[PDB]
Paper text:
The rest are acted on by the third and last enzyme in the PTM pathway, apolipoprotein N-acyltransferase, Lnt18. This transferase N-acylates the Cys* of the apo-lipoprotein using preferentially phosphatidylethanolamine (PE) as a lipid substrate and generating the triacylated lipoprotein product218192021. Lnt is a member of the nitrilase family of enzymes with two domains, a membrane domain (MD) and a periplasmic nitrilase-like domain (ND) harbouring the enzyme’s active site. The active site, defined by the catalytic triad, resides in the ND slightly above the membrane surface with an opening for substrates and products that leads into the bulk membrane.
Accordingly, a structure of Lnt from this opportunistic human pathogen (LntPae) was selected for investigation. Because so much was known about Lnt from E. coli (LntEco), it too was included in the study. The two proteins have 39% sequence identity. The LntPae structure and that of an inactive Cys387Ala mutant of LntEco were solved by molecular replacement using the native LntEco structure as the search model. The two structures are remarkably similar with RMSD values over 501 residues of 1.2 Å. Despite having different residues in the active site pocket, the catalytic triad residues superpose almost exactly on one another consistent with the two enzymes catalysing the same N-acyltransferase reaction with similar substrates. The fatty acids of the phospholipids are predominantly 16 and 18 carbons long. These similarities in membrane lipid composition help rationalize the near structural identity of the two enzymes. Sequence alignment shows LntEco to have an heptapeptide motif, YSYESAD (Tyr325-Asp331), that is absent in LntPae. To likewise investigate the head group specificity of LntPae, a lipopeptide band shift assay was performed with LntPae, and with DOPE, DOPG or DOPC as acyl donors. However, transfer rate dropped significantly with PG and PC. Qualitatively therefore, LntPae and LntEco share a similar head group specificity.
Residue numbers in the entry: 3 to 237, 242 to 351, 358 to 503
Amino acid sequence: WISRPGWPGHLLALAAGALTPLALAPFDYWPLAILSIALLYLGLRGLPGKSALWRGWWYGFGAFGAGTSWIYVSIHDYGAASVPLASLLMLGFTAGVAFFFALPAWLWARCLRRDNAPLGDALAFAALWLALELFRSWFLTGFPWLYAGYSQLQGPLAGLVPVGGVWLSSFVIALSAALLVNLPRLFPHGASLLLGLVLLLGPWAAGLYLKGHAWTHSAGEPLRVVAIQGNIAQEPNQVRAQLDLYRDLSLPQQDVDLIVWPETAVPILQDMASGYLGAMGQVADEKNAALITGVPVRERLADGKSRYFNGITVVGEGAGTYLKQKLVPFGEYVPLQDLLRGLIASDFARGPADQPLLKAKGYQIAPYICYEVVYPEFAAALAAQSQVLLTVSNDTWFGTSIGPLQHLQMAQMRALESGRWMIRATNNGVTGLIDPYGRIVRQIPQFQQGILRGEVIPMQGLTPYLQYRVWPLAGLAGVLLLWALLGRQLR
């Protein structure tokens, strides 16, 4: 009755979708990520296109409702919203984002093969799953949240994360879930049962063997890191209060190499901060350290106009000013403003792709501002030809609940995916250091005014995911989606 249309199967997909947060942020129970995909694969078995779109919608409604439930905290606290209004707004987002799972489930019903399902279909569902995750990361601005692959960060597939990224982890989980469903119709046939076990067990044996493997060389003697966070919340009179606070926590520090300040640590633009940032560079020079801080960067145009960017700059022992490439749709700009800005009755602009890295202490550092970390293909380009990873972010916008913890799990994955140390400096949310294996070595408690002291090692060499990015896996997926497309076309 699970695979037959109507409500009984719809409501199973809700609870199946709702198991996504359990496999991910604090809980990290990875087996539940396999149940979610298996119950959806079995739930879609016999459905026509008319009701298969709604099973996928009811699965995404459960996944994004429970998994992104932190969004309700953002609407309530920082959106000045009452409980019934915030329940409605969160319900409007969840129902819209739930179509990321509705479309592929509908298209699945038109690529789905039950007759040869035992093997061809399990491979085809993994290919369909990788395709919808890749679709999520781009479609409008992208919504790369709740990927199945992040479940295995501390699990047995952590050896495949450096090989294939979060993509390969999600591919194996989707393949393994669909194979279990097809397993009882396998064993009567010895040949297909043996091949099904190599497809099921093969990647998990390879993942455990490759766990903790060092793909990246040691690049030199470690840099001593100092990260400053401060609890600024919704605050121009207090500009001088912030400049004093960040400086006063840096000056007593000694035996330092890197000093890292989170997103918009200096609230004034770097044009008006030239005297302050030069004075902080001299403070950094006598410590023989570099000061890496976020600042808004303004570009004067040829007209009487200005172009504002969300930047990160380095003074003292390092150089370069990086601008944020990809932004948040209604937080940092207005999409289709000539239309939607007349209906909104918001600031920044996009940064260039030809940007260089940030040089500090002679090493290269790949900057990431806010959630640019959640985009796996974009981060891999910066992580390559970079010795150290650094992310400068402001997590107060998410809220007090799960936002930073899910976001931090994605930042650990990028370090595991590149085999690089990451310096995560946040204004309120989790600040810490992450080793090449995705582990959190040092972290200061959130929602407090702390200082973090640590050591990161620059990393040389390269990771198989940084060499061949998702193309080889996405190519295999396109072939697996063709054999399913032509297998139905030929019948």
